[PDB]
Amino acid sequence: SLLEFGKMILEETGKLAIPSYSSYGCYCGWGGKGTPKDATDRCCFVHDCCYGNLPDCNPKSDRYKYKRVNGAIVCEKGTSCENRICECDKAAAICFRQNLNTYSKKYMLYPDFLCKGELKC
């Protein structure tokens, strides 16, 4: 759920999900339309797509358990949905960490009309 995802993000990047990754670019937060603005925005695009592969799961509210094995994020056994949701979140958290260097404040609160383009999962 958002609770685990938010904790994962903070632990990985030192940034709080809200407001750092909740209104960034075209896909971090709202999701919607267009072409991803940068690497961080692409991480959210892929994350949206990952959730998109789980039509009968409820990623925002279904809680999962995860632990740290000397740095590495390890998803613990739960229901199949919980396992898959955790893998999606884990990938996003790592992706955010991998692209922290290019994270740009100019993409925060990015306006909707500037999100144009075509990009299928």
Ligand SMILES: CC(C)NC[C@@H](O)COc1ccc(CC(N)=O)cc1
């Ligand atoms: C706690 C606050 C007030 N509530 C807003 C809450 O809905 C969190 O906002 C969100 C919801 C969903 C997303 C996209 C994602 N992380 O997959 C990013 C940010």
